[PDB]
């Protein structure tokens, strides 16, 4: 069995002052197909792979192709997946909800390197044996997620950086807290970054988050991110402020609104500004199909 | 909803003198496939995007990629398109109708230079940034197109040269008329053409029709095509003649036909004399899957 | 009508001194869609075209495409297909059936150089003008296969060497006889391979057979390989021994066993010796969607 799933995005993407002789706004957009094979057995044992293509505006070659695969074995609850593969660090909860616009960004988002998922493919040929391998489980409330990338299979061991992340998170109807640990993230020596985030969900209609990082060797430093949202119904409004320990940088902030025009079409806009006083905003339309 | 369309051809394709040391007569063919998605809502608006991953004979590597993204949304017989659009001159009807053979030929087209839909990839980086702006409505049996393109959305505008094209056609039972204008066709500053086609259905198996153009900066200069075809039920016969301003120039002229073997496959043929006097001929089949 | 099927595969890839500075064993993992197009026809004739995006791990780029495409038109048993085409020495039965794995891979494999459908693009730019012309029949139990290679069909004939083969195959309950000649095999020039294959089926669960091979300009010389395998009910013992003219060659040979997990699913594995005396041994898992 194989099937596609995916989806569309597009609207104004602007960012003040994004460089001489350059357009401020210009309109980004996004198309993305997931192809997935499944192989279902009656020993209840699920057998699968993925491939992604994705194209982006601004893409070299005006062309669209596939990235690496990803393969996986799920059972009772289970899953051990290999190749290109999804990251603790990336997987876990909590850690990106103070995301807003179309293109789902926020500078409240955590400021280090570490891998995770590659949706394209990549020219350097630094991915070109890249391989990982992921597991996560699923104990009622409780949700485990172990991963370990090797950048360079074919290489002995010894010689290159290998990243290993454990995360895990847990979720009442009220109450949220997450965790994640990552060394050697992005393959980089002492690059030791941590996740602890906790949220409120003060309301069925609003939730208020508080995510504190380690961001290892970034110069941005620790950081702290407060964040908030809150449904009228079909719209969405969302709200957040960020912190880091990096001397002279300006709080990061960002206020957006999210409408629901129907299942599977989102419209999402909103206005932020980064720690270095970047002014950016953002408004567009997202069909899942 | 991602549907999957498409289609497959190949045949013979001749042409005197193709080249010292080169083979006259080649088995050029093609695959196309496209890729759809779909986003219905009850609100009565439709969201899509759909992807394209084409192969020819003789493309480079011996490999198929996707291009560039096209979306779009339509509502009341509204259709505003963004990214890789369709364009007003390559849209509207008549223009293409003299075509023949199964590679769907004719020296009869327009002899100009203008933006339309980018099939394939380009490894020039030309199309990178390039990104437009179609809308179409169809106020029962009239047709209007409107497309903006600018080749690089990136740099500030006044710095580009962007292509404008406005067209619209109309059709009762026996009569068809169809006028176009592009300004900067092709981001070519001063390359200005336009069309002006007519057409008599002089029967429900036969069509006699007269195209004009002003190919704006191109050597060919203006330009008239007469064509014409007839149906024997299954089978189609195709004529045309073609002059153009440029001195010294030939009368281009080819006789092609058609047979529907049966539905979704069709055989066609056809030997056409260019403007410099180059003879080409082709038979194929052509499957619809 | 557009259907897709393929299939994924992982495990673990041994080689013995695979190389100073590399690891002997790493995950080799494979992922490969096929994507056929065909329009059927009430005239009994069916016409298709399939594409195909296959990902092996260590693949440039960490990227898939599509490679060249193939047509086919099949009527009353007897199949002609054009353009990346399947070829005769490729095609025929038994010769292949000696190996084993989840790589599906044997020393006992002819050792000689030829064209067969190209499942990648290829960088060189060395298939770009690849094309071929396929022809199979089947004449109930016998099985006719002829294929004809241009390698640059572009340029004329007589500069070009192209690849001619002829097949054949036919079988019974529990005999099975297979040969198959091909003349300037990969386009080398005087590189003419020849096939003999021989099977008897001693038992539902077993067979043992024995191929002759004539590889031509390969210095591997005439080779003989001898194999069988053994069905217990779901688990399958294979075992081959192969020989080669070269001087000094050491004997190939290899045991392995397969494990039909469910239907779809292939647990397999082995341990194989080359004939410069490698060693190589695997253990993977496929599945079929």
Same mark, same amino acid.
């Given at each position: ?15 003040? *002052? ?37 194209? *982006? ?6 062309? &669209? ?26 997987? =876990? ?34 991915? *070109? ?12 409330? =409780? ?6 990338? /090797? ?9 290159? &950086? ?6 895990? /998170? ?51 430093? *620790? ?21 880091? /320990? ?18 599977? =079409?989102?419209?999402? #806009? ?12 953002? =408004? #567009?339309?997202?069909? /899942?199909?």
């Amino acid at each position: 069995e194989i099937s596609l799933n995916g989806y569309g995005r597009f609207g104004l993407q602007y960012v003040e *002052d994004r460089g001489v002789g350059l357009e401020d706004t210009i309109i980004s957009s996004r198309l993305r197909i997931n192809i997935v094979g499944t192989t279902e057995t009656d020993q209840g044992v699920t057998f699968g792979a993925k491939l992604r293509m994705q194209w *982006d505006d601004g893409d070299a070659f005006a062309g &669209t192709a596939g990235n690496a695969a990803q393969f996986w074995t799920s059972y009772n609850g289970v899953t051990v997946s290999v190749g290109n593969v999804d990251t603790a660090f990336d997987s =876990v909860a909590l850690t990106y909800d103070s995301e807003m616009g179309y293109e789902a960004s926020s500078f409240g988002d955590a400021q280090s390197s570490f891998f995770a998922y590659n949706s394209k493919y990549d020219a350097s040929g630094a991915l *070109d044996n890249y391989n990982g391998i992921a597991v996560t489980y699923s104990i009622s409330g =409780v949700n485990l997620y172990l991963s370990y990338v /090797d950048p360079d299979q074919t290489v002995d061991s010894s010689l290159v &950086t290998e990243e290993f992340g454990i995360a895990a /998170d847990w979720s009442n109807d009220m109450i949220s807290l997450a965790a994640a640990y990552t060394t050697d993230a992005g393959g980089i020596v002492d690059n030791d970054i941590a996740f602890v985030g906790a949220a409120y969900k003060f309301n069925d209609a609003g939730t208020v988050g508080l995510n504190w990082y380690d961001n290892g060797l970034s110069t941005a430093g *620790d950081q702290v991110t407060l964040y908030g949202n809150y449904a009228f119904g079909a719209t969405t409004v969302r709200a957040y402020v960020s912190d880091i /320990d990096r001397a002279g940088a300006d709080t990061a902030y960002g206020i957006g609104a999210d409408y629901q025009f129907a299942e599977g =079409v989102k419209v999402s #806009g909103s206005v932020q500004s980064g720690f270095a006083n970047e002014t950016v905003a953002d =408004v #567009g339309v997202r069909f /899942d199909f």
